[PDB]
């Protein structure tokens, strides 16, 4: 098991919020692009980044990848449900439970980024990131779509100085 497995696992688990959000936006007829990258949130991200002593611009870049990867899952769900509406989940999403999960996963990701900051700047980061994703792909049984989302969501983990 790799040193970055805990950050990648938290990122993969966070990707899973795409299924519940997709379910609500489909029935609510809401745009997937209106997804919260707005000034107040960007400020709030950067402040919690300074509070953990990590570079906000790095952290901002990570969540920018995270949002692109999550929008991608939601778009893929929408295609599937256009092709075949009956494969949509029959159960409504638990958004209130998702809120608490996102708060916790957000916090775990930031605390891991500080805890492992030294490694993310080292030349061996890329090799460690591969091992982490390869482990997380196996342990969470990620399908092809989530594997790609994980790659997009972590593609700038090692862009750290």
């Amino acid at each position: 098991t790799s040193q970055l497995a805990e950050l990648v696992d938290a990122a993969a688990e966070r990707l899973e919020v795409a299924d519940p959000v997709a379910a609500f936006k489909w029935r609510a007829q809401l745009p997937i692009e209106d997804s919260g990258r707005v000034e107040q949130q960007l400020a709030k991200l950067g402040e919690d980044a300074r509070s953990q002593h990590i570079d906000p611009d790095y952290v901002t870049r990570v969540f920018d990848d995270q949002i692109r990867a999550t929008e991608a899952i939601e778009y893929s769900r929408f295609s599937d449900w256009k092709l075949n509406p009956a494969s949509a989940p029959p159960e409504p999403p638990d958004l209130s439970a998702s809120r608490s999960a996102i708060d916790s996963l957000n916090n775990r990701m930031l605390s891991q980024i500080w805890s492992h900051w030294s490694l993310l700047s080292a030349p061996s980061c890329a090799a460690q990131l591969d091992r982490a994703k390869r482990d997380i792909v196996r342990s969470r049984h990620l399908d092809s779509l989530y594997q790609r989302a994980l790659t997009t969501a972590t593609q700038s983990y090692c862009q750290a100085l």
Partner: peptide
């Protein structure tokens, strides 16, 4: 709207 960029934020329409 329903946001996910940093916080899961939900406003009923």
């Amino acid at each position: 709207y329903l946001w996910t960029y940093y916080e899961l934020i939900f406003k009923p329409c």
